Every structure is written in structure tokens, then in C-alpha cells.
Design a protein around this nucleic acid. Structure first.
Ligand code: ZN
Lengths: 934, 94, 98, 36, 35
DNA sequence: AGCTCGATTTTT
DNA sequence: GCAGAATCGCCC
């Protein structure tokens, strides 16, 4: 059985009405996409603030009555975002800077993109969709919509039924909801003005939802993409080719020696992404515990509304490095430029990136001229990234651009320049600004852009095979200890690590390395370590005895071990931000294209283009290519998904009489029902892999991995004890003037140690010999390139160096993954001008006076030495990936895939990345103790 | 380069050469020269990045910068030395 | 099971589906435990070859020509073996057989 | 392709009456049509 | 029809056919029996 | 009446 | 600039 079969009958969506007198408007604004002057905005779907507790995210939607006596049911999940469309001016903006709507409109035209075109009718008047007796001036109005019928919402084809109102509690607020049904539930018809339409809602979806999906396919005709997605949902067109006519190609593809095969592969990859991504998004999903806003731990110490709003701002700062990485990285998913051809045979077609390529003119599928290109434009100068490239990253949407600018306000400036206050009182106040007219100089988007200028990427026109950067929620089962997935199942490496934490608990050390009793002096400091060393060395024996008595080939199983991370495919598992909707959807569409490339190449090698255009070639071949993709993309090493059949148990169900309800009369009927679709494709995870052991076989690479053995002078200060010798310095050497670094470097060269005025000499001679002895033993034995910060990491390093020695792995360092974790800090506002608001600034002396008493919140990332404890906290992650493809072993001829962890491009991403083969990075923010309870 | 890379390189160049004397006053003078009054709020996360390989030194640098801040001298390398330079047992081991 | 007959006769159903079913068979029948076969491309090295003048030979006159030549088919499916198996050891697990 | 059983009593007298014995007919070709 | 070149029809069939191999073990025994 | 088996090559 | 890999599940 399955979650689809178990879901109940219901409507295609709801209109929610919230009372303005009691609803928490400043809280929802911190999670929203509001800009100054908006008429619509997006907010997340959350139980206890935007929907009532116990909301069903999975449903059977009643969408068609073939005659008045039969119903058809479609199984679908909800769409992740809620659209706020009536009295929306009552919700505060997320960003204060003026002029964004005109800037978006101008920039959409120079890139040749399609603007929203309104229907010839007016928007529905309040009295058409409001319940009986409620005052339209007293309420806030918003839509929740199912993933299968959201194009019908956009196109004005749903019907609202006010007589079927239900009263619901949303947090404290007494709210109301009205159901939405597709006009195909009325076979005799309803009048065209009786259907629900709002032009501001449809325009908001055009910009904030559909334009970014068009950018992910390299399509400009957004309105035609919405029309073909609607017909695919309502008329079962998944195996019919449909996007190929909308495609466009650059001069590097048209001039190519293999251009005819390249145009077919690029087109077929996009067709497959449009067939499969909507099906996986519509599927029935698990309900995460993070969807319940009133059980979020982050509020637990708050008293009153101001404390709750300030807690949400700290929560948002912890997510900002994920969002700013997708802006600053040259290889961001937002800058994917198309497909190109060389690499080995199955890698020969690949995904490309570059903003320079995205500015160029294009040609159509029949090699005729199409878009004519843009020549470019500001304060960053000629040939460099400009504010228009940030508008392009935000899909020309003022709602998305406002929330991007809000996250960029947490970022530090890095000068490669006028002082901040002489810029704000000077050139920012000029009447020439097309955004503020100089009348809001401290919050203006051009002021934020000027501050962050040297962190934006370069503008690229090349076609190299690089990794691309993805963002989203992690899955349940990550393998990120030092030997990754080594002996994960059959005792297991997981059980070995649990045994070590139990021994460390008997020594008074917790899972984060905190002591129940701090060391008193030299004897106690030596005693503390000798007990941990003996406890680790005891567990190595019991483990090596288990491997021996079972004849397990552990000495060869080390050679093939990988680190593993799971990228989740559930849309409801993502963090409660509307920018993460776009980052998740665009990551999924990109991964489906990259998986499809060799499948399309092998089919076209057998069935050549012979001078046909891609739309002609797809007309014959696409139905067969869908079935090859379903067989060869899934369970082959990257993507996992489960097929299922959906069934309804009863032959009839209790439903309202929709003909009576349209005339205002409410009573029940047992309508006969059957499913309009039976097959469902439930997505599970995308799997990311990194190889642990270099085996010396590739002779070009050895100099990056090789272990030296000669006796260095830095062996104590770069050894295993230096962080502890610093943490305990004031207890080891009471009131000494010396730095801990100089004391131990002086010992490392002169062989002498200071003895406190009443303390005993020989006690310190022993401390010195312990430090010397263990540091030389570590210099000889170590293949894990870490200086440990806590006793748990010290213990785990000692353990894994023992296993690698029993395997004969002594010549090379192993690969490492390091987590970059956000830390939030308050700083003086002098260089953070946005704290002044829309205020007029008249002089640099007044800017200095007004900022002198103020503080700004900022975020920096710190490197963890221990990724596996971060992975236990169910983190939000950002990482680079390449999907590599290869043949099977033992004479097999099938294609298999791996998603391999890669590198970030662009010097503005994070200062910890500023200069390797043997160290790779991931950004991580934990969710346990923020949105999920321990 | 970013200016924070040049500060970091200049500190690793001092600490890798300073011998037979403790380095914290010469590191603090190079920070007060390069950042001036902005040292008064230098955080541990910023200090650890600037110290690079020698990030263990950060607590002693921050304790030293608080003495300059609270003693009310101006933020310049000449005044920093004039305050700091105005304001042991050792057994041998086998 | 995925593409049901819905009262169509087999010739009507095959008209839409058969080209896809050929490609499923090639992927799922070969190297899956009974039948083995190797796909290959066939190529001819020379652009012309020594052949009799067939127009003269039809009229009884015999002499050679270097006729330009190319392949009318390139893909070949070379069959290898069909494999027959018989289990050696009964493990006692199926209690009806012992 | 699992090895099975012959049906029909006329096939060969050695088959006239098991789970645990199976039969194949075989004629050698080395020393008949191919040289050792 | 005709049989192929590689048949495994000794008492334990394809047991240890590749990696000493069961084929090599049978060749060793025939050499001892030759002596 | 008459096991269960993820599969390919290798080839003596 | 920045390896290599037949794959699925299982979740202690
Ligand atoms: Zn301005």
C-alpha cells in the first residue's frame, strides 16, 4: 500500500481569509517576498500560521464530471508556496529599496523575455468569492493550490463555491476557507465571469514561478511554456514531444562540426525534464515535522511579538550563506547556459555555464535568426558583472529580487574606495538614480550592489566541462565519518563508533567533547589523555578480533569506500523560504537533463538525424526515448524513485451536491467515483559520492597525496595537542606572560619549560615528555590531515589511523570533506548603511552620527573538523556536483552514473576557500533545535 | 587579492620569522597599523581567519587589543608600542 | 500492463506500440542469463573495388572496373550461445522435497 | 534455461520407471568429423 | 543441435571455474593417475 | 509425475 | 587547474 491510495477526496485548492485585527502580519512578512509597492506576494505553506493544524498535503482532487452522475479523481500533493492577493498592502515588505518593478520590466525586455499578458476580462470582484456576510475590508486573502491544477489557477479556469465555506483556526486567528474546483466539474457549463480570476496573482506566478523554469530549459516564451504544462496535466501528453519548437541555440552550437546531433541531444534532454519533473513534484509526499510552526524550537525562550520577530531574523541569517553562494559562484545553477560537446564517450556531451553566453543572439531549430542579443550596460565598470545580471538571476521578478537583496544585506564586504558615509551622502544621493531618485540612498539596491561589488563573479563566454552548485535539504542516511560507507552493513563501522562514544562516556566526555570535570593541572592533563588513548586502543583490539574470526576482507574493503550524502527529493523538506522553491525546482530540472545526455546520444547514434530538425526527428522517436529513460535513469547510481499504483477503496464517496452549492444550497450526495490516472512515480533521493583512498595507481597525481616522514620543527604546534595546550594554558601555567604558541615553540627548539612558583619541577618535566612523545608518534603514524579541536575528534582520528595501518595504507593522506557552518554576529553599523532605512541623508557627519549608536547583524562561516556530527542534525546543504557516466564490469554493456562532489568557482564565495585534490567543502546549517525538536 | 589576504600573508610572514621573543605585540602593532580604530571590535572569527596557520594565537591578541581600547590611547602603531612596552623559572629537559 | 489493449485487436495495438517494444526486447533479452549476442559495425576499407563490368557481362563481354561502393546496412547482431543450467546441491530448505 | 524432463514412454528404455537424476542424449564429433 | 566450446559437467559443475581452479584440480589428479 | 537462480567476460 | 566508480535495499 502507498500514501496516494490512502489520501482522501477533496477540492482542487482553497481560498483562505484571515482577520486583519488579530493575524501576526510582521511574522509572515519575515518569511515573505514583499517589495515596496507590491499588489501580490508569496509566503510558505505552514501549519499554525498560513494553514490550520492537521492540513492534508496529499489529496484525491475531484476535477471532472463526465456527466452529472460520475466523478473523476486525480491524486496530487499541494504546491509548496501560498499566493497572497487581497489586501496584500497590509503585509510589510522584506526589503525597503524603491523602484524594483520598473527595473525588472526594463531588464526582461533587453534579454528578450515574455511579460505577463492579462486576460480581456476584469479580476473577480470580492462579492463573487467571499463567504456570505464577511466584510472584504476586514480580511487578508490568499490561495493554496494543488500541484496538478496550478496552471488552471493561472489561466482563470477554476470556480470558487462560497456556500461550501469552512471555519478554521490558524494559530490564534479565527479564519475561513472556500474551496476551488476546475470548471470541468460543471458539464452543462458555468458563465465565463463566474470563474475565478485575479490578474495580480497570475502576474506574480508568471514572474516568481514560471520564468525561472523557462530559464532552466533556455526558453524565452514563458506564456507558451505555461500552456504546454497545462495540456500535459489535463490531457495525459507526457509521452508526446512538445518543447522542441520553443528551443533556441547559440553560435558555438550552430558552428559545431556535430551541430545536427548536438541540437537533437539538447532538445531531447529538455523534453525528458518536462515529461518527468512535474510527475515527481505532483506525487504523494511524506509530511515533515518541520511543517508545524507552533512546535518550532527556535521560539521556546521568546516572550511577546518583538522577541518572536527578532528570533525569525536570526533564523534567516543562518540560511543566508546558501543563498549568497548561488549568487557569488561562477558555477551556480542560476548561470547554466546549455549543452556542449567535447572526455570519454559517455561524458562527451555535458552542461555549460556563463553569463556572457546568456547575453548572445540565437538561432531557431530550422537555423534561422531568433533573438538578436544584448551588448550589456555602472560602478563595477566595463565587461564586469552589473545589477542587470542580479536581476537575471532573480528571474526578472521584483518579489524574488527583494528577498535576494534581504539575504545579501547579511554579507560582509571585501574590498579588492570612498568611505561608506561619503558614498551614501555623495553619489548615492544623486537625482540620476533610476531607483530612488537619490531620495532613499542608504537602502537603495545600487548602494547594496556598490558595497558587495568585488564578490560578484566574472562574465564568461567559454564552453568547459565544470561541476554546478545545488542547494536543498539532506536525506536521512549520510555516511560522512573519516572512512565513509566502509562496513556500513554486514560489527558495522556505525556500531564501532557507538562503542567508542560509550567508552568516552565512562571517562566523563559527551558526544560534542564537553567534560564533566576540567583538568586541574599537569598530572590531570596527562591522565585525561592516557585514559582516552587506552580506551581507543582497547576498542581496536575487539574490532580486529571480529574481522579475523569472520575472515572478512577488510584490507580490500577500505580501497573501495566512499563518503555519501543524500540530497532529498521531497519539496516539503526544504526550508520555509520562497527562494528555496526556485533553487530546488531548478536543481531537479538540471540533474534530469545531465542524467539524460548519454541515453539520448546512444539512441541518436543508432537512429541518426540525417539533416532533420529536432521537432521532425522527435515526432517519430520520442515515445521510445521516454521508455529508455525510465529504464536507464533510475536505480543506476544517482536517482532513486519508486513506481506505484493508486487505488480508491469505495465505489462512491460523501461529497457536496455541487449543482445545489453553485445556487447557494448545501447538502450531501454519494457520487460514484473512479481514478483518471493510476500510475504514480514517487521520488526518493539524489546520491552524492566522494572517494576516500588514493591507491597510488595514477602516477601523475601522487605529489598531492604523498606522506612525508622527516622530523619537522613544527611537530608540537602542528601536532595533536596544541589546541588543548591553548584551551588549558591558564591552568597549566598560572599567570605566565608567554603565549602558548611561543612556550611550546621555545620547547620545540631549546628543550626547556617554565615551573610556577610553588609547583614541582619533575611534574613539568613529565608533561613536556608526554607532549614530545605523542607529537613524534603522530608525525610518524598520521594519514588524516586534521588538528583536532575536541576529545571526540582526537579519539576518532586515533581510531581511524589504526584501521588504515592494519590495511597497509601508510604512503598517502586520505581525502577529507569539511563542513562550513554559519555563525551570526552583531557588529557596529558604520559600514552597514541599510540599518538607517528610507531616511534622507544630507551629510557624511550626519551619517556618522546616526550610525554611531547602531548595530548590524552579519554572518560568517567557520570550518568544522568533523562533518559527521553536523550530518546528525539533518542539515540544509549547498555543494558542487558533476554527474560522471561509465560502463558496467564483467563484460556488461549498460551505462551507470555517479554524482561526484566537486569544487566552487569564483573568489567571492567564501574567504575559507581562498588559496586542493585532497580537501573538499560543503556548506551546512543544522535543523534540529531550530525547526525540529530533539 | 582582497585586502584581508594581504593582512593574512603579512602576519604569517611575521610569525614564521620571529625567534627568541614572544610575537603578540608585533602582531598587534601590524593589525593596529592596517585597521586602526576598526581593531576595537575585531571578533574571534575574523581574528582566526587573519592569523591563518597560527589561529591558536587569537585569544591572546583579543585580550591585548582590549587593553589598548580600555587604556584610552589612540589607534596608531606608535601609541600602541608606547602603552604596551611601558605596561622566569625555566628547567631544561632531556 | 502499462499500455492496455482496451478492446483493440493486436494489429491495431501493434501499429502504435511495436517500435518501442523492439527496443525493450534488445535491452532486456540479451546478456540477462540465457541468450548472448554481440552488436558490431561493419565497414569496407576501400572507396572502390575490382569487379566485373556487369553491363558488358550481360552482353557476353568480360572485363574489370573499379566501381565506387558503400554499405547498405552497417549494424550486425552476431549470436553466440544459449546457456542451459542445472542446480547441483539441495540445501534442505524446501521441506516438501527432502 | 533450466534442464528438464522428456515426455512419452516411447523415447528410450533407459528413461522407463526422479528429482535427482536428469538425462541428455550425446554423440561425439572428435574422431568422426573433426581430427584429434 | 551442436554444443559450444565451454561446458561445466563434472560432479560440482561451475564450482571454482575461475579465481587453484576446479579445472586445474582435475588436471592435477589425471597427472597423478598417469604416474 | 519433475528445487532455485542479479547478469555479462575470462577459456584452461 | 581540481582522481574513480555495475547498481538497487538495509538504517542497527
Ligand atoms: Zn538610488
Amino acid at each position: 500500500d502507498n500514501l496516494g491510495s490512502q489520501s482522501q477526496p477533496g477540492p482542487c485548492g482553497y481560498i483562505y481569509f484571515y482577520p486583519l485585527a488579530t493575524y501576526p502580519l510582521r511574522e509572515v512578512a519575515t518569511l515573505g517576498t514583499g517589495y515596496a509597492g507590491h499588489r501580490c506576494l508569496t509566503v510558505p505553506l505552514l501549519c499554525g500560521i498560513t494553514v490550520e493544524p492537521g492540513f492534508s498535503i496529499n489529496v484525491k482532487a475531484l476535477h471532472r464530471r463526465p456527466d452529472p452522475n460520475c466523478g473523476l479523481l486525480r491524486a496530487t500533493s499541494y504546491h509548496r508556496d501560498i499566493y497572497v492577493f487581497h489586501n496584500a498592502h497590509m503585509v510589510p515588505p522584506i526589503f525597503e529599496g524603491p523602484g524594483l518593478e520598473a527595473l525588472c520590466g526594463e531588464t526582461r525586455e533587453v534579454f528578450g523575455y515574455d511579460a505577463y499578458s492579462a486576460l480581456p476580462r476584469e479580476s473577480s470582484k470580492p462579492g463573487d468569492f467571499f463567504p456570505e456576510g464577511l466584510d472584504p475590508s476586514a480580511y487578508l486573502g490568499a490561495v493554496a493550490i494543488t500541484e496538478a491544477f496550478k496552471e488552471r489557477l493561472y489561466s482563470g479556469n477554476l470556480v470558487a463555491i462560497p456556500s461550501l465555506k469552512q471555519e478554521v483556526a490558524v494559530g490564534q486567528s479565527a479564519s475561513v476557507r472556500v474551496p476551488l474546483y476546475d470548471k470541468e466539474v460543471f458539464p452543462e457549463g458555468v458563465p465565463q465571469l463566474r470563474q475565478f480570476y485575479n490578474s495580480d496573482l497570475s502576474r506574480c506566478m508568471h514572474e516568481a514561478l514560471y520564468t525561472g523554469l523557462a530559464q532552466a530549459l533556455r526558453v524565452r516564451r514563458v506564456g507558451k511554456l505555461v500552456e504546454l504544462l497545462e495540456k500535459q496535466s489535463l490531457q495525459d501528453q507526457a509521452k508526446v514531444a512538445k518543447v522542441a519548437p520553443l528551443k533556441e541555440f547559440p553560435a558555438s552550437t550552430i558552428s559545431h562540426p556535430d551541430s545536427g546531433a548536438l541540437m537533437i541531444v539538447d532538445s531531447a534532454a529538455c523534453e525528458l525534464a518536462v515529461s518527468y519533473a512535474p510527475a515527481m513534484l505532483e506525487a504523494s509526499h511524506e509530511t515533515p515535522a518541520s511543517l508545524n510552526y507552533d512546535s518550532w524550537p527556535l521560539f521556546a525562550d521568546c516572550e511577546g511579538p518583538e522577541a518572536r520577530v527578532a528570533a525569525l531574523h536570526r533564523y534567516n541569517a543562518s540560511l543566508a550563506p546558501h543563498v549568497s553562494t548561488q549568487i557569488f559562484a561562477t558555477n551556480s545553477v542560476l548561470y547554466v547556459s546549455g549543452v556542449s560537446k567535447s572526455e570519454s564517450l559517455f561524458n562527451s556531451f555535458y552542461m555549460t555555464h556563463g553569463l556572457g553566453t546568456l547575453q548572445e543572439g540565437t538561432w531557431d531549430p530550422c537555423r534561422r535568426p531568433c533573438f538578436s542579443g544584448w551588448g550589456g550596460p555602472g560602478t563595477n565598470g566595463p565587461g564586469n558583472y552589473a545589477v542587470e545580471h542580479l536581476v537575471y538571476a532573480a528571474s526578472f521578478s521584483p518579489n524574488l529580487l527583494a528577498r535576494y537583496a534581504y539575504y545579501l544585506q547579511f554579507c560582509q564586504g571585501q574590498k579588492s574606495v570612498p568611505e561608506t558615509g561619503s558614498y551614501v551622502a555623495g553619489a548615492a544621493a544623486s537625482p540620476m538614480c533610476s531607483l530612488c531618485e537619490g531620495r532613499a540612498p542608504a537602502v537603495c539596491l545600487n548602494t547594496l550592489f556598490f558595497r558587495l561589488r568585488d564578490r560578484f563573479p566574472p562574465v564568461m563566454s567559454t564552453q568547459r566541462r565544470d561541476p554546478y552548485v545545488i542547494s536543498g535539504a539532506s536525506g536521512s542516511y549520510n555516511e560522512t565519518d573519516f572512512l565513509g560507507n566502509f562496513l556500513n552493513f554486514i560489527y558495522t563501522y556505525w556500531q564501532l563508533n557507538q562503542n567508542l562514544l560509550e567508552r568516552l562516556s565512562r571517562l566523563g566526555i559527551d558526544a560534542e567533547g564537553k567534560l564533566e570535570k576540567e583538568p586541574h593541572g599537569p598530572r590531570d592533563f596527562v591522565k585525561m589523555f592516557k585514559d582516552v588513548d587506552a580506551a581507543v586502543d582497547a576498542e581496536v583490539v575487539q574490532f580486529m578480533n571480529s574481522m579475523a574470526k569472520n575472515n572478512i576482507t577488510y584490507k580490500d574493503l577500505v580501497k573501495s569506500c566512499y563518503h555519501v550524502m543524500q540530497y532529498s527529493c521531497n519539496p516539503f523538506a526544504q526550508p520555509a523560504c520562497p527562494i528555496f522553491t526556485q533553487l530546488f525546482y531548478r536543481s531537479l530540472l538540471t540533474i534530469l537533463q545531465d542524467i539524460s545526455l548519454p541515453i539520448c546520444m546512444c539512441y541518436e547514434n543508432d537512429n541518426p538525424g540525417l539533416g532533420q530538425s529536432p521537432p521532425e526527428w522527435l515526432k517519430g522517436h520520442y515515445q521510445t526515448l521516454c521508455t529508455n529513460f525510465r529504464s536507464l535513469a533510475i536505480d543506476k547510481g544517482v536517482l532513486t524513485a519508486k513506481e506505484a499504483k493508486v487505488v480508491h477503496g469505495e465505489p462512491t464517496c460523501d461529497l457536496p451536491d455541487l449543482d445545489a452549492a453553485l445556487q447557494g444550497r448545501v447538502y450531501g450526495r454519494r457520487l460514484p467515483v473512479r481514478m483518471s490516472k493510476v500510475l504514480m512515480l514517487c521520488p526518493r533521493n539524489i546520491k552524492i559520492k566522494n572517494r576516500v583512498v588514493f591507491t597510488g595507481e595514477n602516477a601523475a597525481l601522487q605529489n598531492s597525496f604523498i606522506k612525508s616522514t622527516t622530523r619537522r620543527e613544527n611537530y608540537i604546534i602542528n601536532g595533536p595537542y596544541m589546541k588543548f595546550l591553548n584551551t588549558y594554558h591558564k591552568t597549566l601555567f598560572p599567570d605566565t606572560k608567554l603565549s602558548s604558541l611561543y612556550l611550546w615553540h621555545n620547547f620545540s627548539r631549546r628543550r626547556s619549560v617554565p615551573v610556577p612558583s610553588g609547583a614541582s619541577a619533575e611534574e613539568y618535566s613529565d608533561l613536556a615528555l608526554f607532549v614530545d612523545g605523542g607529537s613524534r608518534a603522530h608525525e610518524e603514524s598520521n594519514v588524516i590531515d586534521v588538528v583536532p579541536g575536541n576529545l571526540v575528534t582526537y579519539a576518532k582520528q586515533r581510531l581511524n589511523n589504526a584501521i588504515l595501518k592494519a590495511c597497509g595504507q601508510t604512503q598517502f593522506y586520505i581525502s577529507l570533506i569539511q563542513g562550513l557552518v554559519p555563525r551570526t554576529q552583531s557588529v557596529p553599523a558604520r559600514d552597514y548603511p541599510h540599518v538607517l532605512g528610507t531616511r534622507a541623508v544630507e551629510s557624511a557627519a550626519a551619517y556618522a552620527e546616526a550610525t554611531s549608536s547602531l548595530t548590524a547583524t552579519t554572518v560568517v562561516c567557520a570550518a568544522t573538523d568533523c562533518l559527521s556530527q553536523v550530518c546528525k542534525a539533518r542539515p540544509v546543504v549547498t555543494l558542487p556536483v558533476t554527474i560522471n557516466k561509465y560502463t558496467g564490469v564483467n563484460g556488461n554493456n549498460q551505462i551507470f552514473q555517479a554524482g561526484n562532489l566537486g569544487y566552487f568557482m569564483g573568489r567571492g564565495v567564501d574567504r575559507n576557500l581562498l588559496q586542493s585534490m585532497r580537501k573538499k567543502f560543503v556548506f551546512a546549517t543544522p535543523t534540529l533545535g531550530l525547526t525540529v525538536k530533539r | 587579492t582582497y585586502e584581508i589576504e594581504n593582512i593574512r600573508a603579512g602576519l604569517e610572514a611575521i610569525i614564521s620569522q620571529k625567534q627568541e621573543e614572544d610575537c603578540v605585540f608585533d602582531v598587534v602593532c601590524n593589525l593596529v597599523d592596517a585597521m586602526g580604530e576598526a581593531c576595537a571590535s575585531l571578533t574571534r572569527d575574523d581574528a582566526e581567519y587573519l592569523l591563518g596557520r597560527f589561529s591558536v594565537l587569537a585569544d591572546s591578541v583579543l585580550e591585548t587589543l582590549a587593553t589598548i581600547a580600555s587604556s584610552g590611547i589612540e589607534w596608531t602603531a606608535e601609541a600602541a608600542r608606547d602603552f604596551l612596552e611601558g605596561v622566569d623559572n625555566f628547567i631544561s629537559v632531556a
